[PDB]
Amino acid sequence: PTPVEEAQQKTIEAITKAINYMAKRRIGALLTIERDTGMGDYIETGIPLNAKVSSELLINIFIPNTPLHDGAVIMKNNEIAAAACYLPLSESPFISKELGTRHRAAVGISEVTDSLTIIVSEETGGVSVAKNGDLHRELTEEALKEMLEAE
Amino acid sequence: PTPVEEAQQKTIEAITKAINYMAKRRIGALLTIERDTGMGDYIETGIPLNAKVSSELLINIFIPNTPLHDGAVIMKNNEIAAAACYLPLSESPFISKELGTRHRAAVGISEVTDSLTIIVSEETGGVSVAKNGDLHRELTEEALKEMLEAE
Ligand SMILES: CCS(=O)(=O)CCN(C)C(=O)N(C)C
Ligand SMILES: [Mg+2]
């Protein structure tokens, strides 16, 4: 594989390790991966990081009751661009009524970009993905990894 | 002030704000600022970040019981180069005997580099600085700022 392909694989491994850790501990998380539609307007609302990705940093960001935990992390390729970012809230009626603001923000950004957003529920530990206006819930670890590899 | 001067002042303010937060909560912390002596060999022992400095990120790094809290943050060229880095433990017999490995690590790196290290005690929330093999204990906010500005 090329260096670009290896870097992508390392980033997917970092993300999946972090998401799996947070799901097990019921740490709420909201992680948007920018694709071809630029997300600068939303990146600029958060705290700039421009940091190399690691599972450790992703986990540390979302620890409850910390400066960076509220709002979205936005990733650009192999970097964490910013944390605590604003995302628009979807009004879609196909968001389960029990779900809170993290899921509505994820669907919201997915309606105006081609990004892929991962959500960990602090209530259940369930993992979901928002893409193209649709929310897919209760993902297995294998399903999440496959979705990321396909992205 | 010039852009470089404004950037240095912003970094000092981010550091002091994070140190004050951690001192209040008695969160142990270890933050080494590289100077003329290169510290690449120690940076390489940690988790790479190469992140923009913010008080928020510094606080999120040092939260107890998290991946990144165990070890030193090393700053270089106005960025957080890495977290959870190893520093050498001083064998000096002239460190206050009630202090533990965090402070001995800070003195240790200060014995072999011209770096400035900030330590927050998890026992007391006291703030200290290691430079040139010596530990300056129980610093006020004004004292720490003066040291950073002098450095
Ligand atoms: C974190 C990513 S990891 O795969 O390195 C294991 C996570 N760690 C190290 C951790 O949770 N603590 C509390 C130290
Ligand atoms: Mg299902």
Side-chain angles (χ1 to χ4, degrees), chain A residues 1-8 10-12 14-16 18-23 25-96 98-144 146-151, chain B residues 1-23 25-141 143-151:
Chain A
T2 55
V4 162
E5 280 158 1
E6 297 194 322
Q8 279 168 6
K10 282 190 37 183
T11 291
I12 288 168
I15 290 164
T16 55
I19 295 294
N20 294 348
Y21 178 101
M22 314 188 265
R25 310 178 171 51
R26 279 71 163 132
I27 290 156
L30 175 63
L31 180 60
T32 301
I33 305 162
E34 183 188 79
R35 302 278 77 211
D36 296 332
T37 301
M39 284 179 55
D41 286 353
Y42 305 97
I43 289 165
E44 283 161 26
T45 70
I47 302 300
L49 272 65
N50 303 123
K52 302 163 166 356
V53 68
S54 63
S55 63
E56 291 90 352
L57 177 54
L58 286 173
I59 290 159
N60 264 80
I61 284 165
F62 290 112
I63 297 299
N65 313 319
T66 61
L68 292 178
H69 86 293
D70 263 339
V73 166
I74 301 174
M75 283 180 68
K76 281 196 64 138
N77 210 35
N78 305 118
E79 280 200 341
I80 294 158
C85 298
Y86 162 88
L87 298 177
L89 297 176
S90 170
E91 268 146 347
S92 170
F94 301 115
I95 302 170
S96 299
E98 73 266 14
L99 295 175
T101 55
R102 282 191 186 88
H103 298 85
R104 288 148 203 292
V107 176
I109 192 68
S110 86
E111 289 167 355
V112 295
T113 70
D114 68 337
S115 65
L116 185 163
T117 300
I118 308 160
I119 315 92
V120 181
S121 161
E122 67 175 84
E123 298 299 328
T124 66
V127 177
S128 55
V129 166
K131 172 94 180 171
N132 291 326
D134 295 318
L135 186 68
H136 312 284
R137 295 188 65 187
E138 310 292 357
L139 300 175
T140 66
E141 307 182 343
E142 299 86 354
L144 174 65
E146 163 158 23
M147 291 192 185
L148 287 172
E149 284 165 349
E151 192 47 68
Chain B
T2 67
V4 179
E5 298 172 325
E6 298 218 302
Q8 279 162 357
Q9 225 42 54
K10 190 174 145 212
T11 290
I12 286 175
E13 284 149 26
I15 289 168
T16 57
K17 181 173 172 184
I19 296 294
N20 289 347
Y21 179 105
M22 300 186 286
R25 292 159 181 77
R26 314 188 184 161
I27 291 157
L30 183 61
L31 177 56
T32 299
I33 306 169
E34 192 195 70
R35 298 305 290 150
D36 297 332
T37 304
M39 281 177 62
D41 286 337
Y42 302 98
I43 288 163
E44 291 301 306
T45 70
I47 305 290
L49 266 78
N50 301 106
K52 305 307 180 37
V53 177
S54 66
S55 60
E56 292 90 352
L57 176 58
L58 290 172
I59 290 163
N60 268 81
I61 285 163
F62 289 116
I63 293 301
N65 209 44
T66 59
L68 288 177
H69 84 293
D70 213 286
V73 167
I74 301 174
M75 288 184 37
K76 168 173 163 151
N77 300 140
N78 205 53
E79 292 190 332
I80 294 160
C85 296
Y86 163 83
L87 296 178
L89 297 185
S90 173
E91 299 289 346
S92 172
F94 307 108
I95 301 172
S96 293
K97 267 71 217 303
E98 82 265 26
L99 300 178
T101 50
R102 203 168 263 118
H103 296 81
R104 288 181 57 214
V107 176
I109 195 68
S110 86
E111 286 165 357
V112 296
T113 69
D114 69 337
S115 65
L116 186 155
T117 300
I118 312 166
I119 315 90
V120 182
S121 167
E122 82 172 55
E123 299 279 75
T124 66
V127 176
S128 53
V129 161
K131 177 132 170 120
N132 295 329
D134 286 297
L135 185 69
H136 305 282
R137 294 196 61 195
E138 305 190 292
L139 302 173
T140 67
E141 309 182 9
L144 174 62
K145 177 159 226 203
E146 185 194 353
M147 289 174 175
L148 290 172
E149 291 175 331
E151 184 57 49

